[PDB]
Design an enzyme around this catalytic site. Structure first.
Site, PDB file in Angstrom:
ATOM      1  N   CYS A  29       0.826  -1.231   0.000  1.00 14.36           N
ATOM      2  CA  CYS A  29       0.000   0.000   0.000  1.00 14.36           C
ATOM      3  C   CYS A  29       0.852   1.269   0.000  1.00 14.36           C
ATOM      4  O   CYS A  29       0.538   2.255  -0.707  1.00 14.36           O
ATOM      5  CB  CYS A  29      -1.057   0.053   1.097  1.00 14.36           C
ATOM      6  SG  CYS A  29      -0.302   0.258   2.748  1.00 14.36           S
ATOM      7  N   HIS A  90      -2.399   1.455   6.755  1.00  8.55           N
ATOM      8  CA  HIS A  90      -2.863   1.342   5.397  1.00  8.55           C
ATOM      9  C   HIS A  90      -3.125   2.728   4.876  1.00  8.55           C
ATOM     10  O   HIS A  90      -3.626   3.559   5.600  1.00  8.55           O
ATOM     11  CB  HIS A  90      -4.113   0.466   5.283  1.00  8.55           C
ATOM     12  CG  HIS A  90      -4.473   0.142   3.849  1.00  8.55           C
ATOM     13  ND1 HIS A  90      -3.789  -0.769   3.118  1.00  8.55           N
ATOM     14  CD2 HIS A  90      -5.523   0.605   3.035  1.00  8.55           C
ATOM     15  CE1 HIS A  90      -4.318  -0.826   1.865  1.00  8.55           C
ATOM     16  NE2 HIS A  90      -5.383   0.017   1.816  1.00  8.55           N
TER      17      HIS A  90
END
Length: 155
Positions: A29, A90
């Protein structure tokens, strides 16, 4: 052709790149956001998702809602959705588009978790993040729009 086309383009082009050499962006990510930022020429804190969130928290304007996030992205700004994790955080790129449940904006992101954490623009942040996390997201926006004027040749 739309005002924010450069954002989606950078998302698309970054998908198969490997910001961390040897690790595909779709499986990373942080690397996927780094590659999008570098295509746009937007300076971005380095390191994993947690360290990136720390850096954005210090330097970027934080937006009030997911709705507001999709509004800015629609104007050609880079908008990062982020949340720190106990072990891993994230981050995702917010893009313009209909809100999921009237709240959560569409996004692009990769993830070492696999398909559950991946979005090629078809999932909102409220589908990518856990239902306990999606109301706790931070939306950071860059101080200048990345996209340029549409082509002069446009009708």
């Amino acid at each position: 052709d739309s005002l924010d086309q450069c954002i989606v383009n950078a998302c698309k082009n970054s998908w198969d790149k490997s910001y961390l050499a040897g690790t595909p962006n779709k499986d990373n990510c942080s690397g996927f956001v780094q590659s999008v930022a570098a295509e746009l020429g937007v300076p971005m804190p380095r390191g994993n998702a947690n360290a990136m969130v720390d850096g954005l928290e210090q330097s970027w304007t934080k937006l009030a809602s997911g709705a507001e996030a999709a509004q800015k992205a629609a104007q050609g700004f880079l908008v990062i959705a982020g949340l720190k994790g106990r072990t891993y955080g994230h981050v995702a790129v917010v893009i313009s588009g209909p809100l999921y449940r009237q709240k959560y904006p569409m996004c692009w992101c990769g993830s070492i978790a696999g398909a559950v954490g991946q979005s090629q623009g078809l999932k909102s942040v409220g589908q990518v993040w856990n239902r306990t996390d999606r109301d706790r997201l931070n939306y950071y926006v860059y101080s200048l729009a990345s996209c340029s004027l549409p082509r002069a040749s446009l009708e």
